[PDB]
Amino acid sequence: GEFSVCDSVSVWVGDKTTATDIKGKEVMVLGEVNINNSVFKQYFFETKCRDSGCRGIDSKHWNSYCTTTHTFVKALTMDGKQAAWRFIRIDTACVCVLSRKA
Amino acid sequence: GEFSVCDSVSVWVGDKTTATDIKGKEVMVLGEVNINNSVFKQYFFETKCRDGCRGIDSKHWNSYCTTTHTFVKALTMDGKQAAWRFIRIDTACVCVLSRKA
């Protein structure tokens, strides 16, 4: 059969209050969005790592570890006093990264 | 230094016309979105593989690099009804293992 090299875990995120946008700024994410008289609760699909490196790595010639990478998704947010549609950083994957020894 | 086990590539995607939503249905993705008298071009951040995996113990493991996905909300069309739907886009390149024999 088939296994992950790095064990991931995926959930819905419905209680996001803060985030950093693509321009590097810390912003406030609203709980509710309004698109043409339609009230949707603002939810996010996120994937990250599940906490001796990665599975199946040739450990003789390689150090390694599992790391959470991210994606940018559009979201309704607040940069101080100005509300806007901004791209924000959320967890999206767990991937293995290598390192040569010595 | 530090390397990827699987080589990925990330781009903006601004010409998406179709997609499959989270319920398994093939839907049409609109080019433009309208949120409170504000017209935004509908863009997507996607990552995928660059055409086994680097650094794998190939003696005990078969392996290959594979594109995984995420769900992101988008303005869409299921036939005649416009709606805010989660759709599947490329989000990562990850290695998957397989025991030999």
Partner: antibody, heavy 121, light 108 residues
Framework: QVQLKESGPGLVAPSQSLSITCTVS????????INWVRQPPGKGLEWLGM???????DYNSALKSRLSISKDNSKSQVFLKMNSLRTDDTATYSC???????????????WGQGTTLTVSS | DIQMTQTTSSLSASLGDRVTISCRAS??????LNWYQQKPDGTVKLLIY???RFHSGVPSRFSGSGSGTDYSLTISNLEQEDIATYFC?????????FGGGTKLEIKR
Amino acid sequence: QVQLKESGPGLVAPSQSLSITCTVSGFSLIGYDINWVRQPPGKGLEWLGMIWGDGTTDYNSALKSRLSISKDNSKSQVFLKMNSLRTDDTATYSCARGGYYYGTSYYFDYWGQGTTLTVSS
Amino acid sequence: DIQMTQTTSSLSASLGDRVTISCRASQDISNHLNWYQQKPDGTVKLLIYYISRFHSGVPSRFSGSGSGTDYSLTISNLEQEDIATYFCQQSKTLPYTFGGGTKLEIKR
């Protein structure tokens, strides 16, 4: 430390309503889909519907809109409701957590035991 | 809907044998195919998802394959605890559907 437990009446007459609650523990309903499933005696499983993480729902069209699911995230409970029962609704009913491997595939990773329901006069 | 079919709903094998549970989708489901084990005690457990992937805490001897609309679960080295019913499920599209299951007798 992840379980689901369903509690229900056991007997309801034709044309009366049905309420089952799924009590959940070891995880939060804010983050996970919950599915409802049904196995009539000596027959195959049948998916009834689900409440997504965000509170939205989808139902099996075969039920002709007789079924509804609602939830209270703070109380860790999902609520199945069915109107206008028939002897055909005689089954064991179970709730199951939805689990995702990225947005790539989807499965039911954790299953409740099941509550037996007989519809009869 | 997408029908999932398990044409042989009964199977009998001996300890150590390799058994194949098969499943057929009525339309292409690509890889959105899960395998469950319902033991006689009533409990249900996810064995395999996405055709061939293992859920955590599942034996090496389980194995998932597929060709076209056909999908197999293979249990190598059959052990006594494998007395159960084995059923598939497509997670491609709503409504989700299940095969009617394949019950496994272990000879003695």
